[PDB]
Amino acid sequence: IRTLLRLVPAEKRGAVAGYAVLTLLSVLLRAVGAVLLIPLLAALFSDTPSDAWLWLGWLTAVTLAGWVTDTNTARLGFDLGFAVLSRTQHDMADRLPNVAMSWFTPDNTATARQAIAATGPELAGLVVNLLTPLIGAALLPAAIGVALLFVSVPLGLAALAGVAVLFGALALSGRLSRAADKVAGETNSAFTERIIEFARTQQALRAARRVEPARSQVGSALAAQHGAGLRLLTMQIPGQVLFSLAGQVALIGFAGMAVWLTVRGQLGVPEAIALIVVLVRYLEPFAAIADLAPALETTRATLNRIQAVLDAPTLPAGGAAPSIEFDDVRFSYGDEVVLDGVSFTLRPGNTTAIVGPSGSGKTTILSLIAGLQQPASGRVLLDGVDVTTLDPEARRAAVSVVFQHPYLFDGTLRDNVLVGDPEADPDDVTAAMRLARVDELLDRLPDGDATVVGEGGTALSGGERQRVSIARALLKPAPVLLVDEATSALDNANEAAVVDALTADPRPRTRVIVAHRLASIRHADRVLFVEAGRVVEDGAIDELLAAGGRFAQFWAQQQAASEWAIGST
């Protein structure tokens, strides 16, 4: 795999060169240790075994050299494995904040989580557990085959061709094995896919009293599919049997060829036995590759994940209230379109209040305003400057956001609040906590503003989490304050905090609120009713109410809904 050349750090390139040359030396020494069995066993089986001492001395000298080179390569392997683990992990961790948000699809999120989490021990010992044995076992049959040219041209040539034949057999065996595993997984998933539907709809089937017909139907379907399911996996039989049979047939071929050359007189009987033994050394590495094949597959999967994360797209580079303006902006989550020629302008300082149906691109519009994503077409302007051309520091310093989810981390409530502006003085922090009505939560907490807000530290409910999120947003000195509402009716103090944020905040900054209830948009200077990704009504509150349009219907629905009570009309 060629990705490893990029993964290894630049300061360890000399270690890579030393590892490569020492691995070639190790394979050469093992080949000489194996090919030295030809004269050694020729002398041992002869009528004067005393001649075997010299070749045994040479063999044990080669074995000592092999031990020295092998321990050197093992030391280099541990060093390089730890180094490449550190380099890959740090590069992956630094890359992700710069990765564009469009890349974070749930499958991509899963792959990145797997790459960060499960790649510690594997990449730690990758180069020692996999690369060195794999390279040794791959090159040693070729080394012995080439080295046997001098002993016998036809025998060496046949062994060298057998290298290619047996590697082809290994590749075919791997193909059939993984294909059979895929087929097995597919049939199991197909059989159980109806049990998942039976378990998912168990409440609906039980309550509707259809559990007995549904269960009988599922069982009959399983039986019917199993009746025809006895024809599967005809290609699993040559999965591993094919490779072992190929290896044993190659062994019999080499032994028979040695016997034939003995009959033809080109080789002596002792050297024929020695060649049988050496050509059994020749086939021995191929078993090691087959044993290492699953680990190679897992390593290939992990390296594919690391390559996918490392190749993710990157965002290009480039205190009064800005005027946020849209010019035919279009955006799409792949193929589905979320905006279509949306164009509007927000006056600086006027608290715009986006509203509309769900899945209409409200949160998407806020995200494009905040620069999390970019417009697939058109422009997103902040005071006439395109958002894409903003500097990264200016990109961070321009917009503050309250997300739908709170996005809190384990730690003190205070430290959560300061991330809006860690250099902020205590006065600004107190102002932010008051405007967010976090001081009421401080009475609840035992340790005050230093209380840990992690799940293991303190289990805060939705209202408290949203209040600290509002404090985070208010603390930061961003000239734009987006408030993507996720306000819960279980906490009226959250609604009061949002109203204070849109009203009590003294900083003169434009604000955009994506609201569900009428508690917040009462103080809206203008409204954008966004339906199906296109602004259908725009204007002031009272203007839209007088017009009797869609926003008037929405106002009537929400106002009537707030006065709802069960058991009376």
Partner: protein, 557 residues
Amino acid sequence: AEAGSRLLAPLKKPLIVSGVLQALITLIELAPFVLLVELARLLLGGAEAERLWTLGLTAVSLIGLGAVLAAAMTLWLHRVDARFAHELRGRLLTKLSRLPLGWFTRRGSASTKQLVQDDTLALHYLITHAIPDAVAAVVAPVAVLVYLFVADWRVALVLFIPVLVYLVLMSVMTIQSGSKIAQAPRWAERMGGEAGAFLEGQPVIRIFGGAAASRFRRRLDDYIDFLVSWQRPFVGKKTLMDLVTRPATFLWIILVAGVPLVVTGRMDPVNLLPFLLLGTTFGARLLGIGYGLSGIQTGMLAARRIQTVLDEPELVVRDPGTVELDRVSFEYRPGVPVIRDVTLTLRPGTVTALVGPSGSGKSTLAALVARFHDVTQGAIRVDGRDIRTLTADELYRRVGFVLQDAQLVHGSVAENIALAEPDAGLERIRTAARDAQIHDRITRMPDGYDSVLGAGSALSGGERQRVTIARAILADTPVLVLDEATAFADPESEYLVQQAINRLTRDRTVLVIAHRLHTITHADQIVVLDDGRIVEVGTHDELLAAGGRYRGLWDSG
């Protein structure tokens, strides 16, 4: 431990026969490495070509027999595996139709997906691959050792030098690193959780930035340093242990122990050939036992999970809509009460609201009312009959429920609405949909009422909830457990769902699980729960006048 074996009890004899066949196949696999020793015995004798042709025939026959036996054994094993797996899926199907409905709302345990799809596949791999592979990996080294000892015990003993040194270094490394290897999985799951948190909180880093990245980077650096400090001091032990078991070292030991014997005449030179053929790779063969044992362990864990499922406690059947709770007490986990001696009487036609703080256990009592679980103490009577003596159909034609996370069944919209009463005509389905404030949207869909629903469709949450409410309207259940969170599940369509619930609560003994206090002031009864026990009961006015916990909750609202 016995649970894992109990699932595979009927496959005792087939597994033993498969193991015997695999032992035979492995012994046949090593046959040519004995025929080669016989060939060396034969060539040195210089016998006729016939005595070598017969040996070639024997080798060809043995490899062919090995291939045929492997094919037949894997065919038979796959057939038996399919036969058993179909039975297992049939037995899991019935269990899912008799586990209590609360079992499916579990947490802290594997989902049904991993539990039926992945674990059954793991059992398939256990039966077909892991057991035969492990039997092979155990039979091969034992047979090789026996053959080498039969050849010449003097040279067979020196192969215990590298093997025993490998064992000694392995044991020293294991005991020296017991604490770290015990602690390693905790670090792994901690880093996995931290990586998930770092990926989840990406937008905050995008806008706010700050120390969010450094917090994860410190954890990553600590994990890398932990791995390095764990494995760095064991570089020497690991590399020496790797060197000792290599085939080249075995070959050198074999020759150094054999040439002195052969040259001195104490050993036949042919008797050394078994060691050079089979014994040199003995280290890799002994290293392979652990892989097979790991495979068996991985399969048996899945067997354990499935058997733990098949022995869950399934719902026992013992023996004008009024519901009586009589000294009810419930414990999800033993020794951890969640409901403690609650008494109630949902009078007929009275909307008995249920209210309390988060984590008070108010949803649990409604769950017991619908018999999502069985009350450990006391009894719950519906119409004067204990729910525990009511079969499922008789219970659920009396006590319906409209709870959170409404589920749709694969079929037409006229099937989802008419699941309770499929025989209801299309006009009855239409007027039920009108009552649920969903007839407007259904007619807007292209196929109309025949549109196929399922895992995913064109309807959002606030529309499938109204479809389920239409189903509950058409079921005509006198009692009705209700989760008030469905009102604001989709805040856009709150008004329509509220109209649907108002129509659903017409003349039914309803038990509203109230989260919002202001939607209860007209309730004929209110129950204040905390810590799993009833505190204050009465109407809105009486509870407020009492100056109790309800007044505090109302003021906080």
